Design a protein around this ligand. Structure first.
Ligand SMILES: [Mg+2]
Ligand SMILES: [Mg+2]
Ligand SMILES: [Mg+2]
Ligand SMILES: [Mg+2]
Ligand SMILES: [Mg+2]
Length: 650
């Protein structure tokens, strides 16, 4: 068929989606160019004078806060604002701190496996720090505050081009993941993976991908919206995590980002006060704004992000995807710096984002890179970030071909993870360069782990390793001496040498042993981001039982679990029932068993987005992946790649 539009002139909502189910073998939208139009309803309609109506049909609307205050159900029948729970938190933390204290050397390595104190467990889940910090229109104040370079050096640009050529220039075609449990974002704002899949099939049928790009590049939002159900705009969500009591933090106010491009931050002053009692020894949960790109934008980009990432994991495994179980042994006999990056994604400059996309255009049609740019710099809409704020549109989505919000490696983008991984390695390879090494001539060898130095990467987490002590101390001298003109990101040593959630305990001379942070099991039980069950914690017993079952695997861990069990038994059990009873009864009601799953699989059930950056299809069984994702195999977008990709297939 000739049809170039996803939404045609056919009557909408005239056929049931049940008559157009995807069989995994043929794209039925090739047979019927009107199918998508007929199986879904009329869009509400775009008003350029009122762009926020793009979100008026969402589950949460207008007035309701992005981060409401609401007690969490931490275990069956146990809620986080109850005074007995808070009493347990205080006593558990006293007793756990009496077990062990972090024992760190001058390089930040833990000698006992513990990297910090247990004080963050005095955080009240469901009690947010407010306001949630807004995203300013400009990150220049941050770049200034962090003392980052004004521009890349010439050499840094060379290195960035050499690495991006390797990344964009190779592709291992891989299925698009279609999330079951997240919103499509505008315009439909539904958690409907069937619609997402049918949209993908429509996009990749006939001439619709080129029609989509033509509509995009026209700058006519009314056209892109009408004919492709697409609008370049971010929604916003909030992520929550524990904090250390007493830690001073700051935030960008909604009223300031409205008035100023790069305003200064204001102090967060939230105190925990529950039913008329102040808890001065507790923290409110740290909160962070995350943007969310619409499905109907990200779907056009994801094939490239996923394919290039998967290629990179194969060709340059030693850098971007080593076996995590083997890292500690790999490091035996090596010196290592564990990177702690401050405000990483937000600290990317416009130059860095733009260069990445420029090199992309050598391998991928330029209009696709321009779509990526449009989303990186898109306007966003947020519901209120605090109790005194209103909903707010930041930027002008009517002018989406112009940059609206400059915020570095924008969250919610198809490319966010790829950019995080590649730029951390650009920075570290530039550091190898600044030491004096000839990194261009030896680029492949560095990335493949064949030189006497290299780096293991997981986005903003990294291990920079050296076979030679003298090379290692030269790297440390470089960090100490590096001037502003060379500084890409704000990086220091990680307290306790943590990588991907594990402490790399120093157990002998250049001998390491990985231990999951000993704070983690207790934070995730006692101070959770979300209540048990619901959308995101259906499988909550698994992570707990997995951790409990390995309690004897490390001597500090073992003692802290003994403190948990004894303290819970005395202070919680009389009122709420036994801990293991609650957890084991819940485990019986879910369709997975902890004994049958790998550690990787349990991680993915707790955080499915680890499939976009940490684990590949090969490492996770179908039943686990299918809990969270539908898939579209790459045969269904092969024609798009034949036209629009110019690199090498792996
Ligand atoms: Mg029928
Ligand atoms: Mg305080
Ligand atoms: Mg001012
Ligand atoms: Mg780190
Ligand atoms: Mg598999």
């Amino acid at each position: 068929h000739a049809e170039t539009r996803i939404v045609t002139d056919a009557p909408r909502n005239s056929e049931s989606v049940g008559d157009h189910l995807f069989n995994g073998g043929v794209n039925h939208h090739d047979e019927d160019p009107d199918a998508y139009t007929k199986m879904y309803g009329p869009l509400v309609g775009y008003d350029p004078r009122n762009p926020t109506t793009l979100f008026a049909n969402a589950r949460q609307t207008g007035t309701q806060l992005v981060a409401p205050r609401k007690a969490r159900e931490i275990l069956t029948g146990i809620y986080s604002f109850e005074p007995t729970v808070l009493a347990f938190q205080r006593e558990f933390v006293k007793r756990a701190n009496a077990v062990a204290q972090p024992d760190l050397n001058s390089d930040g390595f833990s000698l006992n496996g513990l990297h910090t104190t247990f004080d963050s467990i005095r955080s009240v889940s469901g009690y947010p720090q407010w306001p949630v910090s807004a995203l300013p229109k400009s990150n220049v104040g941050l770049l200034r505050d962090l003392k980052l370079q004004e521009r890349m050096t010439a050499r840094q640009v060379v290195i960035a081009r050499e690495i991006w050529k390797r990344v964009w220039g190779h592709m291992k075609p891989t299925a698009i993941k279609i999330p079951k449990m997240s919103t499509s974002g505008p315009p439909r704002n539904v958690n409907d993976a069937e619609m997402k899949l049918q949209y993908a099939l429509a996009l990749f049928s006939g001439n619709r991908y080129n029609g989509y790009l033509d509509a995009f590049k026209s700058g006519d939002l009314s056209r892109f919206y009408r004919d492709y159900e697409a609008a370049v705009i971010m929604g916003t969500n909030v992520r929550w995590q524990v904090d250390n009591p007493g830690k001073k933090r700051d935030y960008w106010a909604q009223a300031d980002i409205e008035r100023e491009l790069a305003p200064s931050k204001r102090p967060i002053t939230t105190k925990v006060e529950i039913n008329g009692t102040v808890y001065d020894d507790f923290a409110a949960m740290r909160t962070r704004l995350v943007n969310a790109g619409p499905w109907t934008i990200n779907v056009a980009l994801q094939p490239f992000a996923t394919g290039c990432m998967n290629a990179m994991f194969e060709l340059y495994r030693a850098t971007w995807h080593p076996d995590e179980d083997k890292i500690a042994g790999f490091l035996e006999g090596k010196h290592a710096f564990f990177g702690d990056v401050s405000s990483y994604d937000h600290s990317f400059s416009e130059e860095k984002i733009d260069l990445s996309l420029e090199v992309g255009k050598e391998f991928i049609s330029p209009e696709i890179m321009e779509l990526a740019s449009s989303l990186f710099y898109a306007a966003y809409f947020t519901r209120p970030l605090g109790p005194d704020d209103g909903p707010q549109l930041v930027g002008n989505p009517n002018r989406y071909l112009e940059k609206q919000v400059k915020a570095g490696n924008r969250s919610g983008h198809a490319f966010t993870s790829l950019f995080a991984k590649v730029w951390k390695v650009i920075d570290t390879v530039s550091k190898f360069d600044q030491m004096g090494y000839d990194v261009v001539a030896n680029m492949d060898a560095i990335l493949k782990g064949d030189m006497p130095f290299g780096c293991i990467n997981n986005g903003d987490d990294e291990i920079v390793w050296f076979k030679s002590e003298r090379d290692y101390r030269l790297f440390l001298r470089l960090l100490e001496t590096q001037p502003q003109e060379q500084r890409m990101f704000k990086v220091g040593p990680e307290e306790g040498a943590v990588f991907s959630g594990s402490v790399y305990q120093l157990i002998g001379p250049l001998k390491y042993q990985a231990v999951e942070r000993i704070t983690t099991p207790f934070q995730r039980i006692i101070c959770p981001e979300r209540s048990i069950g619901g959308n995101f914690r259906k499988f909550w017993p698994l992570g707990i039982l997995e951790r409990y079952n390995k309690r004897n695997s490390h001597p500090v861990l073992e003692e802290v679990w003994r403190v948990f069990d004894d303290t819970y038994a005395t202070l919680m059990e009389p009122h709420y029932g036994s801990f293991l009873g609650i957890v084991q009864r819940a485990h019986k009601e879910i369709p997975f068993s902890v004994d049958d799953l790998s550690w990787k699989e349990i991680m993915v059930l707790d955080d499915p987005n680890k499939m976009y950056h940490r684990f590949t299809d090969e490492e996770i069984r179908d039943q686990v992946q299918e809990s969270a994702f539908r898939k579209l195999q790459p045969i269904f977008f092969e024609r798009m790649f034949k036209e629009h990709y110019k690199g090498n297939y792996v």
